Amino acid sequence: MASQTITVGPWGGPGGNEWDDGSYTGIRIIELSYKEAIGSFSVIYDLNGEPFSGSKHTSKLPYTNVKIELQFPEEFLVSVSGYTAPFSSLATRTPVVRSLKFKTNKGRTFGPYGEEDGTYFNLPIENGLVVGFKGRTGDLLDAIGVHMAL
Amino acid sequence: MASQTITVGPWGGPGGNEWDDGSYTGIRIIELSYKEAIGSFSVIYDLNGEPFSGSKHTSKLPYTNVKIELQFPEEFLVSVSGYTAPFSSLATRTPVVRSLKFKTNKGRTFGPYGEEDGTYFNLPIENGLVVGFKGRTGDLLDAIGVHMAL
Amino acid sequence: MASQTITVGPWGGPGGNEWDDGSYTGIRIIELSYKEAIGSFSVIYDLNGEPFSGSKHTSKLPYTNVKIELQFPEEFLVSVSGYTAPFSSLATRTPVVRSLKFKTNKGRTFGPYGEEDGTYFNLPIENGLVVGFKGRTGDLLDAIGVHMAL
Amino acid sequence: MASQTITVGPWGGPGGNEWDDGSYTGIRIIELSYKEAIGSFSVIYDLNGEPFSGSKHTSKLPYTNVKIELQFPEEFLVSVSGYTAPFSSLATRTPVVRSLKFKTNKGRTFGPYGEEDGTYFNLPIENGLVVGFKGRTGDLLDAIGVHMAL
């Protein structure tokens, strides 16, 4: 009944708990953690020209934390890609996000973070903007998906 | 370069301080002041299921204050209408928003607030949602416009 | 259901037969007739860089024909306005579109066509495009509305 | 300057000649040819409730033709997936579309068609509609991408 955006994904598995940051006006900063898989994931959005911090989707695992700072508004994502697969450290074979990689319209590449093991996924954007993330997190990132707008 | 919505209007005159709340996912509360014209105007938006207070656009004039509380998300605006006309007691005789009235999908009418003098305007929304307001305010609400999505 | 657009209006009365051209990529030509009111109203749309003729909504009345050819794609509408009121030679006081006027981003005004009698309506477009018309036609244009997209 | 949709992909290689059907209001029929790779690809779109013929992107190769007829409007795509890879029958190592598969909101799957060799791609759609295709076609289908709307 409230406003909606085109949403694609998720890529990954059905474990963890779903979260959805919803939609905003663009992306300023992406933060994540990684080792053999992706752990934490959080975003600072643009909301009508000011930063807005999304909720944190934190992993307690001892991973490396990274920060991707885009030159907003002139720089934005044109590609989200990665790999999904079971991870043998978990108690089950549920597929999780093993790797993530981002590319921008200014020709910068961020990543790959994690391990490129399993099934590649790739979302090239020819026209339009990522405006929001949604996903699934348990101990780590089980799945990821994107809201898009013009 | 950032995400955009359809913007219609403004209705009213050219004077006053320009403002633009930008766009959100819906409307929870509208607060305005009125007497001979509309004075203050501010909104508590929905942003992805949580309230978000927009900036206040307060008139310094001692007017009657009113709070319009919609049963969000099931109830939302289907019509924005009112009247614009010069406000004779300013030197510039500039047109301002003299009256506003709001109708909802649930058949509730809020208003008219102010005086029904001058040029009537009406935005009947058959499909889509109001997701943001913009305008101009000096001593009074000089003009108001609307962002739409869906 | 199928793809949708923001839809506003209609302005006018509930007489005549309803029609909806649906949505396209833009507006290339507006064809109308007029005298004391608007008679015929039909549109040549853009569809993906080629013209597409909307259904004809023609009046049999011996009115003056107008053909408005926009400089598509660089020139597009920024305002649709007009007047609605009853028309004395009908069996009921049902309101019809007495006048129309169109303005473009290049500064061109087309109109008024018809007679500026009754209640003024005005749709200023600050951001977005008209991508389709809907309306009601009997012997005259009883009502007119618009589909909008970014 | 004209109206626009979110465009994702293409998936495939840089060879062949660029084509773009543009956008419409939904999909009625997809017809393609296949054997070890995808040859022909063309679509009957919905445009405001009536069928619209897309341009044919046909291959001369002796492949099997198949017609995917959806129960439009109640049935629509919720996934487009396939495989892209070099093809040893060609005089270039450029990747091409080796296989395609479609799924609908009514639980039907069409495909896989062609050969599942190389790099999998997958566009799951949680919210929104495919409203158009674009791609590259030489002797066969080098690449495929999609236009989306709400």
Numbering used by the authors:
A (entry chain C), B (entry chain A), C (entry chain B), D (entry chain D): 1 to 150
Question: Could you give the paper's own sentences about this structure?
Answer:
Crystals of recombinant Apo-FTP grew in space group P212121 and diffracted to 1.55 Å at Diamond Light Source. Molecular replacement confirmed four monomers in the asymmetric unit and refinement gave a final model with Rfactor: 0.163 and Rfree: 0.200. All four monomers are almost identical and their superposition by α carbon (Cα) atoms gave an RMSD of ∼0.15 Å. However, the loops around Leu90, which are close to the carbohydrate-binding site, adopt different conformations in different subunits. Analysis using the PDB and PISA server suggests that FTP could be a dimer or tetramer in solution with stable interfaces between any of the two relative monomers. A total of 970 water molecules and 20 glycerol molecules were built into the electron density, with one glycerol molecule bound in the carbohydrate-binding site. Interestingly, in our Apo-FTP structure, there is a glycerol molecule (GOL18–a constituent of the crystallization condition) bound at the carbohydrate-binding site, forming two HBs bonds with the carboxylic side chain of Asp142 and one HB mediated by a water molecule with the carboxylic side chain of Asp139. There are three cis-prolines in each monomer all of which fit the electron density well, consistent with homologous structures of FTP.
In contrast, FTP binds carbohydrates such as mannose and/or glucose in a different way, paralleling CMB and also Artocarpin presumably reflecting the high sequence identities of 90 and 91%, respectively.
